[PDB]
Structure 1
C-alpha cells in the first residue's frame, strides 16, 4: 500500500502482435503431433493470456487450469486440473516467471503424470531474478527488473483488467 503511478511498458497492440507470433510458433510445434493437447493455465494471473493465446493456437486442444501457491515454503495444489494429461502434449501457460521456483515445482508435479510432452509458455520473463534455472520453451517478452501490472497481473489485487502491461512507479 504505497502512493504510486502506472506507466506503460508494453502497449496493448504490442502484446497482441506478440501473442499472434507465439500462436504461430506453438501451432507449428504441435500441428503434427496427433496426440491430444491441453493448455494448462496457472491461476489466476494467466487467465487473460490464456484467453488470447489459445485463440491463436490452430491446433485442436483442451483448456484446463490449476491453482498453486507456495522463506521458501512448499508449492501446494489449491486446485488441481480437471482433466488427465497422461499421454498428451501439455503446454503450461503462465503470466510471469521471475525466480522460477513456481514453474519449476509445477513442472515436476505435472511430469509425474507422464504427459507425452511437457513445455512452458510464459508471457513475461524477468531473468535478472532467476534463482532456479528452468527451461522455458516459449517466451513473449523478457523484461527489466520492474514490478509490472496488467493483462491479468495484479498489484495487491489491483489492475488485472488493464489491456496493456505497465509498471508501478512509487512516490
Structure 2
C-alpha cells in the first residue's frame, strides 16, 4: 500500500465510487430493459469508470472506445440505429462532450444518453445533458480513478485533489 490522497477539497473514496457506480449501472439496466445499448468510453480518463460501470449493467450490450481532445481515436462499430450511451470521465466546460454528441448524432443513432463520473457545472460554457451522473463537484484540480495528474496517478482507486496553490 502507498496510495495517498492530495490535500485538495475534493475527496471521494473507492467505496463511495463503487456504491455510486452500482447505482448508476442499476438505473441504466432499468431504463434499458428490453434493449441493447452501445456504450462508448471516452479515453483515456473514463476507462476505469467504464470497466466498473459495465459490470454493473446486467444487459446484453456492445462497446467502443474513442479518444478526443480534434478526434484522436475513431469508432469502429456502427452506431446508426443503436441506443448509444456516452461514458465520460468528467464534464466541465461541456465543449468536448458537445462536439462528441454532434459527431454521434451525425450518424443517426436511435438515441443517445450520457453517463459521467464527475461534473463541474460551474465551468459550463455550453449546455450538455448528463443522464447518469456519479458526482457533482466544485472546480478543483481532481485526479485518480482513471483521471491523471500529468499522466500519473490514474491508478489511484479513489478520486482526490490538490490545492490551487500547488
TM-score of the pair, normalised by structure 1:
0.89
After TM superposition, give the deviation of residue 37 of structure 1 in Å.
1.9
Mapped partners of 2:114, 2:50: distance in 1 = 12
The structure 2 residue matched to 1:108, chosen from 102, 105, 108, is 102
Give the paired residue count: 159
Mapped partners of 1:108, 1:58: distance in 2 = 29
The structure 2 residue matched to 1:83, chosen from 74, 77, 93, is 77
Mapped partners of 2:129, 2:144: distance in 1 = 25
Secondary structure of 2:90 counterpart: strand
Gapped runs of 5+ residues in structure 1? 70-75
Aligned to 2:25: 23
**Residue deviations 1:80-139, cap 9 Å, x none?**
111001111100001000000000110000011111110110000011111101111111
Gapped runs of 5+ residues in structure 2? none
Aligned to 1:13: 15
Structure 1 vs Structure 2 CA RMSD: 1.2
**1:140 correspondence with 2:134:** yes
Mapped partners of 1:103, 1:152: distance in 2 = 18
Runs of 4 or more, structure 1, over 4 Å off, are: none
